[PDB]
């Protein structure tokens, strides 16, 4: 990596002295040393890069977003200096975009990545990075065009294949996504050994009836992406008791279960009132989990946050549930009514995290036709009775009754999570 232009070669002794302070962990002295070099040599690209790297390390030491914001600006200043070597220009702007994403400045990172691609039009890795920038902001349409451009010049780029396959799957192009996800994973290219691609390749195969799906789940488990073949969540705390079905006593949330079962009719009645008089509060399931049928959910809490307008629609239920912070404070779960109508098949799927357990309270259960499988075990609901399962295990639902089926879904923190963990885990 050639990082020194002609001028920087003449001051290499001063640059090496400053960088040695950084390598020895004397970040404050290194910051000041590079600051002096920037003052004395304001056009040195290596002095400016050294200043940004020191600010970067200082932000890590101090855990400071603001210090990192200063480094992000200094990385940009490197790019505007005269005679900047190409390797240094790429390194500086790449780190700038990386740190912008870390801070959540997704629009800023996208502008930096666009600049990089314009400066280095033949660097396909930079285009791949640009596609990731679009994916992080939710712009799957532009991400898809980026990876199409990469695959047109390098058809066997494994990184581009898995991301193109990921986008196809997210768009419900199930059959189309399989060879991209499969060949991309099989390429072994850097960035393809990722649980997200194992997850969706196996799921795409399950949807088309490809029995090879569980061979890929087993491989993802062997490579450390899944806790097991059945439990395939990707946002996990390791060591939590892993079990498809739970009894109330096993969870320890027996007071919550008793309150739900004793008061189930008021929960039902408010749910039916919303069905009859405010049915627009039930929103269709929107995560492509249905093969067919009608399935809607009316959410009272999400990410540990109460929906005030939703609780105006079920005020007694929200008043009841507020007494239980083990569910209202579950920032990795929800509290929601779930209605499902005959002719519905929910694809086998898993939730995103092993940090929650999922309770189902039966409210209106037809006498026949409704059942739920979790792992290798299938059960049914009962009106006024709670079922508890770990939805980080693969689960699947059928509704073949002759009338609607209404349940109440209550997520709780996994009981083995300490209060310190329940407070620090990012919301999902």
């Amino acid at each position: 990596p050639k990082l020194l232009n002609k001028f920087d070669k003449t001051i290499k002794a001063e640059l090496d002295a400053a960088e040695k302070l950084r390598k020895r962990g004397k970040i404050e002295e290194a910051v000041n040393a590079f600051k002096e070099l920037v003052r004395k040599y304001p056009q040195s690209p290596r002095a400016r890069y050294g200043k940004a790297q020191c600010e970067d390390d200082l932000a890590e030491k101090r855990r400071s977003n603001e210090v990192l914001r200063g480094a992000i600006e200094t990385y940009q200043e490197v790019a505007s200096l005269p005679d900047v070597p190409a390797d240094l220009l790429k390194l500086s702007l790449k780190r700038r975009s990386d740190r912008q994403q870390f801070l959540g400045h997704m629009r800023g990172s996208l502008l930096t990545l666009q600049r990089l691609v314009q400066l280095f039009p033949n660097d396909t890795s930079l285009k791949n990075d640009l596609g990731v920038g679009y994916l992080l902001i939710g712009d799957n349409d532009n991400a898809k065009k980026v990876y199409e451009e990469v695959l047109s010049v390098t058809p066997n780029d494994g990184f581009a294949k898995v991301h193109y396959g990921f986008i196809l799957k997210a768009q419900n192009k199930i059959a189309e996504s399989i060879p991209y996800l499969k060949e991309g994973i099989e390429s072994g290219d850097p960035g393809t050994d990722d649980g997200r691609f194992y997850f969706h390749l196996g799921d795409a195969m399950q949807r088309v009836g490809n029995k090879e799906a569980y061979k890929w789940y087993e491989l993802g488990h062997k490579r450390g992406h899944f806790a097991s073949v059945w439990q395939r969540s990707l946002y996990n705390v390791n060591g939590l008791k892993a079990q498809p079905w739970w009894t109330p006593k096993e969870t320890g949330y027996t007071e919550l279960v008793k309150s739900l079962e004793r008061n189930w009719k008021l929960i039902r009645d408010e749910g039916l009132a919303v069905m009859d008089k405010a049915k627009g509060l039930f929103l269709p399931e929107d995560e492509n989990l249905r093969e067919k049928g009608d399935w809607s959910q009316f959410t009272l809490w999400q990410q540990g946050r109460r929906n005030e307008n939703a609780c105006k629609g079920a005020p007694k239920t929200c008043t009841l549930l507020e007494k239980f912070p083990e569910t209202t404070g579950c920032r990795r779960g929800q509290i929601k009514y779930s209605i499902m109508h005959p002719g519905t098949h929910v694809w086998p799927h898993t939730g995103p995290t092993n940090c929650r357990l999922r309770m189902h309270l039966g409210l209106v259960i037809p006498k026949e036709g409704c059942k739920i499988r979790c792992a290798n075990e299938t059960k049914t609901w009962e009106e006024g009775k709670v079922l508890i399962f770990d939805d980080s295990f693969e689960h699947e639902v059928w509704q073949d009754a002759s009338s609607f089926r209404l349940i109440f879904i209550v997520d709780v923190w996994h009981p083995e999570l300490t209060p310190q963990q329940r407070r620090s885990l990012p919301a999902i």
């Binding site: 932000a59 855990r63 400071s64 977003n65 990192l68 994403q101 870390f102 801070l103 959540g104 997704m106 994916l135 992080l136 939710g138 990921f166 997210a170 997200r196 997850f199 969706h200 395939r232 969540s233 990707l234 946002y235 399931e285 995560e287 492509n288 989990l289 999400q302 990410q303 929800q334 799927h349 898993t350 939730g351 995103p352 995290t353 939805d391 990012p426 919301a427 999902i428």
Partner: peptide, 18 residues
């Protein structure tokens, strides 16, 4: 988009620095 019931988003958590 949020990962409420599934794992369909590219990332399910938000990025907010340290």
């Amino acid at each position: 988009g949020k990962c409420k019931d599934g794992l369909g988003e590219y990332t399910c958590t938000s990025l907010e620095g340290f």
